[PDB]
Amino acid sequence: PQKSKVDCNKGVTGTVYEYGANTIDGGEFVNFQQYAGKHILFVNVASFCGLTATYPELNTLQEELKPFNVTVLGFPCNQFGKQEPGKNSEILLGLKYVRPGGGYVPNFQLFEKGDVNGDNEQKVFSFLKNSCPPTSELFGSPEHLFWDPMKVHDIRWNFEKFLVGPDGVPVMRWFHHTPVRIVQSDIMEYLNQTS
């Protein structure tokens, strides 16, 4: 049965603090210690997915969880149905004018497009993906999956999500189709549990 969430593995293999990424608007390298001590929600995103419509809900999550020490980070990725064809210089424009359109702007940082699976995957995602069980028994249909090789712990689709705790260690990982409101309420439950 499809679970909404998995808890990440009980040990540690390091933290997110040895990694970084370039901002989509500026190419500026950001090492993730710029978020040292914050709870971080890593989301791989795309612009021509049904789940692209969840961008505004992500804003709501960010806005309502910002007073509680939560930062959302977005990673565009073209590996799932080729649903992020735009260049880095095109992605925010498309979000604003095409889909979601209507003037939509993320209220959280997006980084440069890159891979999250395969032999050129960004290293932070090697760490995240292998710190947690995969989100689903179902790997999917490989005609839609544009990377090599394929592994149990691969990200399954656009808008998969990881929560990383204030020590830089992953805590939980959501199925891409889990409603954003349930991600938000799961995060608050975690926050209230760990005081």
Q: Which helix (H) or strand (E) holds 193?
A: helix 180-193
- To one decimal place, what's the resolution in Å? 2.0
Q: Report the b/e string of 88-112 with b at 16+ CB within 10 A.
A: beebbebbeeeebeeebebebbbbb
Structural contact between residues 35 and 21, judged by C-beta atoms closer than 8 angstroms: no
How many helices and strands (H and E) does the chain possess? 4, 8
Q: Which residues contact 191 (CB under 8 A, 6 or more apart)?
A: 39, 68, 69, 70
Q: Which helix (H) or strand (E) holds 39?
A: strand 39-45
Residue 9 DSSP SS3? coil
Residue 7 domain-assigned (yes or no):
no
User: For residue 176, what are the domain limits?
Assistant: 13-195
Residue 6 domain-assigned (yes or no):
no
Give the technique used to solve this structure. Answer: X-ray
- Any catalytic annotation for residue 132? no
> Which among 8, 49, 77, 132 is annotated as catalytic?
49
How many domains does one find in the chain? 1
Residue 4 domain-assigned (yes or no):
no
End-to-end CA distance of the chain: 31
Residue 184 CA to residue 13 CA, distance in Å, equals 26
Tokens 């939980």 belong to 172
Residue 164 CA to residue 41 CA, distance in Å, equals 6
